[model samples]
Target chain A: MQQKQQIMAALNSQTAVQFQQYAAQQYPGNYEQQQILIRQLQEQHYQQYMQQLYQVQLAQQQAALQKQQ
Target chain B: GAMVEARSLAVAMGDTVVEPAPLKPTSEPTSGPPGNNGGSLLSVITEGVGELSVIDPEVAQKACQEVLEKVKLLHGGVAV
Candidate 1:
C-alpha cells in the first residue's frame, strides 16, 4: 500500500522536471514555494493514479466474472 | 509530457485509448544487476529518472522487474 502510494506519487523524469520547471517558472525564485506547488501537483497526480488503478481493477474483475459465467 | 518513460511497453500493451483518458521504479531486488539478463518489458518500464538521478535504467530494470513479477504472481501466475 505504501509502495503503491509512492508509485502514484512518482512522475516520469520528463513530466516531473517539466512540471517542476513550470511551477518554478510561476513562482519565480522562491524555491520553497515552487516545491510546494510541485507537491500539490503530485498529490493530484496520486489521486489520478488511484482512479486509474481502480478502473483497471474493476475491469479485470468484470472480465473475470464474465468469463466465469 | 509522457508519464511513462517506456512507451515501448505501452505500444506492446494496449491503446489504453478507450473512451476516456486512459492511464498508465526500481532497484534490483533478488537479482545480479538489471539490464544484463531481463532485457524484457520491465527493463524498458524502468528507464529510471532530475532529483531523479538522471535515472538508472539497469537498477531501474531490476526493481521494476521485481514489481512486475509480483503483479504476475497476484494474477494467479497466469497471463491474460
Candidate 2:
C-alpha cells in the first residue's frame, strides 16, 4: 500500500508537467520522436495504474481480516 | 529519479514490491456511441499504445491521470 501510494504521488501534477515538458523539449518538431515519448509515458502510467489498483484491493482485504481478528 | 524513489519508499515501508503487469483496455462488442462510430476516444486511448500509430504525450498523460484519479477515489484519496 505504501509503495503504491508513493508511485501514485510520484505521478502527480508536477511530474506530469515535467514529463510533458521534457518530451516536448526532447522532440521539438519531430512527430515520430514525440510519438515515442507519448507511448512510453502511456506504458508507464498504465503499468503503475494496475499496480496501484492491485495494492488497494490487497490492502482492503488485509484491513478487513485485521478487523475480524 | 522517480523509479528510485518508488524503490526506496517500498524498502522504508518494509513492503516487497514487484513490477506490475501491463494494462490492456477491455473490448466489448455490445457498447457503441450514439452515432455508432468505430469507437470512442476514451476506448481508443484505453486500447493500449501498441495499437496506436501516433500519439500526443499531453493527451495520453491526461487520460492516464484521469484513470489514476478514479482508482484512487475507489480506494481512498492519497495522504497528501
Candidate 3:
C-alpha cells in the first residue's frame, strides 16, 4: 500500500509537469488560466487511475491471503 | 462566454461554477516554435482522458495501440 502510494504520487507529479509544460508551450504568456484547467483535468484522471490501482492491489492481496489459507 | 459544460466526476457526484470542458484556446497565434502544428496538446490530452474513462482495461489498451499506430503513420516517428 505504501509502495503503491509512492508510485502513484510519482506518476501524478510527472504527469503534472508534462501537462504544465504543454500548456506553457501552447499558450506562452497566457498559460496561467489554462494551467488551472489542465491541473484540474490531470487531478481527475490521476484520482481515477489511483482508484483502479487500489482495486487491483486489493484483489491481489486477497488472492494471496486465500492461497495461504 | 458560455461553455458547453460536460459532466465532470465532481459535477456528477456533487460545484462552485466550474463547468465541464475548460475554455478551449481561441484562434490565437501559435506562440511556440515555428512549424509546431501539434495544436493544443492540452485539448488532445483532456479529450483522451475523458474518452478512456469508461473503457475496459483491455479495450483501452487496444484503443491506445490503435491511436499509436495512427500517430506513427502521420508523424513517421512519435515525438511523444
Candidate 4:
C-alpha cells in the first residue's frame, strides 16, 4: 500500500510554506528532494501506525473469541 | 522556522506515537514551538477527531467515505 494520503496532504499543505522557504535556504541539489524526504519520513511513521493497528486488531479478536466461551 | 506535526494511533492494545520530527533550521530557535511538543499533539488531535466522529453522524459517514476513497486512490483492489 501507499502512504497515508490524508496525513500526507495535511502535512504538505501545512508545511509547504516553511519547507519551500527551507529549500530556498539550503539550496539542496534538487528542491524536490526535500519533498521526498518528507514523504519518506511520513511513510516510515505510517508503517509503524499500521503495524500497531494490526497487532491491536489481532489481540481484540483473540479476546472476543475467548469471551465467547 | 522549524515545524511540528504529530498524530497518535491509540488502539485496544496500546498507544503508538507518530509525528514529523522537528526540523532544526541549522541555526533555528531553541525548543518549544507554538504547539505542544512530543506525543501530546497527536493524542489531542486524534481525540478530537474521534469525538467528532461520534457526535456527528453525517460527518462520520462522510469521513468513512473519504477514507474509502483515499484507500482506493492509493491502491486498487487486489488481483487474483
Candidate 3's TM-score reads 0.33
- Overall lDDT per candidate, in order of appearance: 0.51, 0.53, 0.50, 0.46
Candidate 4 residue B45 C-alpha distance from true site, Å:
27
lDDT string, candidate 2, B1-80, tens digits:
22332322112234653576635545444555557455433433342323322323354466576654553455446532
lDDT of 1 by residue, B1-80 (tens): 33445323234245455566544323223755445555333435352322343333343344433443443345365554
TM-score versus the correct structure, for each prediction: 0.38, 0.33, 0.33, 0.28
lDDT per residue for candidate 4 within A1-69, as digits (tens), equals 333555444434434554445444434667686565445434443454445556666887989899754
lDDT of 3 by residue, A20-40 (tens): 655565467787765764555
| Model 3 residue pairs with clashes | none
Count of clashes, each model: 1, 0, 0, 0
Q: After superposition, how far is residue A23 of candidate 4 from its true place, in Å?
A: 9.8
Regions more than 4 Å wrong, model 1: A12-14, A67-69, B1-80
Model 3 segments more than 4 A misplaced: A1-11, A25-28, A67-69, B1-80
Second chain TM-score, each model: 0.29, 0.27, 0.26, 0.27
Best by DockQ: 2
Which prediction has the highest lDDT against the true structure?
A: 2
The CAPRI classification for model 4 reads as: incorrect
